[PDB]
Design a protein around this ligand. Structure first.
Ligand SMILES: [Cl-]
Length: 241
């Protein structure tokens, strides 16, 4: 079947409500968790991700990661910029394995560290960790093909960002043009998540979808239990395929 990947900003909105959402999300069918590590600097994050980072400013991040690791048994991927840890890439990857997370996803890996790709994949893989590689429409087709054969768990393909203007092309067509390039499992991630966009990706052959900002929005406007119920809804939609 199809994989439901659920993102949440570590500690958002508060520590107790964050664990409630994660546990509820996993109970309602999340297959993979992505946890957003608040960034040491500003980068390619949109308005609603940034505001989620604002509300957990100064969070003690490692005890919470440890804590949530004890609470749920699904694969957990750390979402953080290779930027914030390239100075210290060794004590980061050891800490990640120390607290028992399954892998990482560096969004800026293929952008700002493309020449370091093969070294960094090698080190991650020889720590037993998963290197989940981020791609997007601006990643050239042959690079996408390259990383599709090395990406662990799945290759991630991000469309519909909250920042900027979306590509005025149907998600069905966008995924049609990468599905045959990706030998891996293909997870399509969304900033804006219309149901039409999600069904377009699944019907175009994506092996799952990743969603996150939709949950941050639903929490702020209707609360954690409402956001948990959205997970149930997305699970049912993926279960139609
Ligand atoms: Cl797009």
């Amino acid at each position: 079947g199809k994989m439901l990947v659920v993102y949440m900003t570590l500690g958002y909105p508060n520590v107790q409500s964050f664990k409630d959402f994660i546990i509820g999300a996993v109970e309602n069918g999340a297959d993979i968790l992505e946890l957003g590590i608040p960034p040491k600097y500003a980068k390619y994050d949109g308005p609603v991700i940034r505001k989620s980072y604002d509300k957990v400013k100064g969070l003690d991040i490692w005890p919470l990661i440890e804590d949530i690791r004890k609470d749920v048994g699904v694969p957990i991927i750390a979402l953080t910029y290779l930027e914030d840890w390239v100075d210290q890439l060794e004590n980061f990857l050891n800490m990640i394995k120390d607290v028992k997370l399954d892998g990482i996803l560096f969004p800026d890996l293929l952008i700002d560290y493309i020449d370091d790709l093969d070294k960094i994949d090698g080190i991650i893989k020889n720590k037993g960790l998963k290197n989940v590689i981020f791609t997007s429409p601006s990643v050239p087709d042959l690079l996408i093909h390259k990383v599709s054969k090395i990406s662990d768990l799945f290759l991630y393909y991000g469309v519909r960002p909250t920042t900027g203007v979306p590509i005025p092309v149907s998600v069905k067509q966008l995924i049609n043009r990468v599905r045959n390039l990706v030998e891996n499992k293909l997870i399509v991630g969304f900033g804006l998540s219309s149901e039409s966009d999600l069904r377009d990706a699944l019907s175009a052959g994506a092996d799952g979808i990743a969603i996150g900002t939709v949950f941050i929005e639903e929490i702020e406007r209707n609360g954690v239990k409402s956001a948990i119920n959205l997970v149930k809804k997305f699970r049912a939609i993926l279960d139609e395929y």
